[PDB]
């Protein structure tokens, strides 16, 4: 024949991405999450994303609460609309969430819907209309355009891309997070 095929188990690291994302949102000040020291932290024979919901709760990670801005963004996401008005609302939404709730973890379908994928929104600058993304399937943190992040949100929030195991999909935060109120002299 000239056909040689070995039969071996495959593991995707997509399933490990929720653990990385959990560390991002639970950690502070460039350290790791202090309660790290279970299958939880295993590469092989660990906990798949689809199974992680109870563990997220136990780490005081919760879905972001309902709000007018969030309702408005979801409506635009469902309608597949992007314009200056949607972008203004997106900026206001991401800014409020980052300020008040801290870094967000997004759990979403992979493009093509094979696997779930977790990544984090860690920062925003209105000066350049870019979002700081920590996606552990990349080699490093990346600043991405608003439209590129909007496309990621579309997979999590537009009904075209959702099914039953997608109840876990959405935006999460560290329930322990409190903003630090800075004072300036001038």
Author numbering: 21 to 32, 41 to 65, 72 to 220
Sentences from the paper on this structure:
Based on this information we have prepared two deletion mutants GtgE(17–214, Δ33–40, C45S) and GtgE(17–214, Δ59–68, C45S). Expression and purification of these mutants resulted in high yields of both constructs, suggesting that the mutations did not disrupt the structure. Both mutants were screened for crystallization, and the GtgE(17–214, Δ33–40, C45S) mutant produced large crystals diffracting to high resolution. Our structure of GtgE shows that the enzyme has a papain-like fold, composed of a slightly bent seven-stranded ß-sheet with two ¶-helices on the convex side and three on the concave side. Asp169 is located at the end of strand ß5 and Ser45 (cysteine in the wild type enzyme) is near the N-terminus of helix α1. Thus the N-terminal ~20 residues complete the papain fold of the neighboring molecule, which in turn donates this segment back to the first molecule. Through this swap of their N-termini the two molecules form a tight dimer in the crystal. Since the molecular weight determined by the SEC-MALS of 25.5 kDa indicated that the protein is predominantly a monomer in solution, this swap is likely the crystallization artefact. Comparison with papain and other papain-like enzymes suggests that helix α1 in GtgE is longer by one turn on the N-terminal end and starts four residues earlier. This additional turn of the helix enters the area corresponding to the classic substrate-binding site of papain-like enzymes and partially blocks it. We conclude that the function of GtgE in vivo as a proteolytic enzyme is likely dependent on other factor(s), such as a protein partner or interactions with the SCV membrane, which cause a realignment of the catalytic triad to its active conformation stimulating GtgE activity in vivo.
GtgE is encoded within the Gifsy-2 lambdoid prophage. The critical base was identified as His151, the nucleophile as Cys45 and the third residue as Asp169.
